[model samples]
Target: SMEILQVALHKRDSGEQLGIKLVRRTDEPGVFILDLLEGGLAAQDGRLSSNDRVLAINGHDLKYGTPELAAQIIQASGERVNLTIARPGKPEIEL
Candidate 1:
C-alpha cells in the first residue's frame, strides 16, 4: 500500500536551499528522501520524512521513470517542486 501527497518547497531570495537529500533504491526503482536538512524547506514544512518514496514529480510517474530522469526534474525545478509520495499500508493514490 502507498499514500500520495503533494509537497512544495521553495528557494530563498538569499539563495537558501531546499536541503533535501534524495536517493533511489538499487534493488528497486523508486526514489526516496534520504535525508532532510534542519531548517530546510521540506524540514520546516514537516510534510516529508526520510524514506518517503516519491511516486512522481510534477506529472511524471517514477514507477516507470529512471533515476536519471528524476534527478533532472529535481535539478531543473527553479522555484518549487511537486511530489507524489507513498508509504506502506496506505492506499495507492490516483493520478
Candidate 2:
C-alpha cells in the first residue's frame, strides 16, 4: 500500500471530495479551537490557537450544533474549508 505522506491542499479540496468528518470531542459552549498537535493545516496556519474557542465556520454560525458536529463539518469538508473564528472577528479562512 502506498503511504500518503503529505496530501496537497488542492488535492483535498472539498470540491473534489476526499475528506470525512472525524469526531474529536463532544460539543461544548464557548469558543473551541482546532487541535492540530498532530501537525495539520490548522497547525501550519497557527490560527487554531488552542483546543478551545470557536466563532464560525464557512461563514456559518457554530451555535447550530455541538462542538463535535462543527468539527465534523470541517473534517468532512476535506480541503479548502471556510472557517471564521470568533476572537479573530468575521472573515472566511481556509482550513
Candidate 3:
C-alpha cells in the first residue's frame, strides 16, 4: 500500500481560520480534510484537497489525534503553518 505525501501551508493572521474542516477518517485512525472553505486561505492556496488524510503538523504526529488536537498543534506553530498530508494511492483517478 503506497501513500502519497504532500505538504501545504496556510498563512495565518489575527482572527483567521485554516479554512479547512477536519473530521475523522471514519474507518481509520487519522483525520482527513473534510472541506475547504471558499475564498479562504487554504482554498486559495490549492495545495490542500478534501479527503487527504493529515498525518502531521510541523513535526508533531497528528495520527490518532482529534480535530481539536490538530488545531492546537497548528496554533502552537508559527503563522506559516506546515501540513503533512497522506493519501493512499495516487491522485490520478483510481479504478
- Tens digits of per-residue lDDT for model 2, 17-61: 322222234554554554445555555545444433444555556
Superior by TM-score: candidate 2 or candidate 3: 3
**Number of clashing pairs per prediction, in order:** 0, 7, 0
RMSD of each: 5.7, 12.0, 2.2
TM-score between candidate 2 and the true structure: 0.49
lDDT of 3 by residue, 12-69 (tens): 5744777899997667788789889998878888878888888888878887888989
lDDT of 1 by residue, 1-95 (tens): 55667887776643555677878777876787888998888889899988788788877788666657777877776666778887655434577
On lDDT, who's better, 1 or 2?
A: 1
TM-score for candidate 3: 0.81
Off by over 4 Å in 1: 13-16, 64-67, 90-95
Estimate candidate 1's alpha-carbon lDDT, on a 0 to 1 scale: 0.75
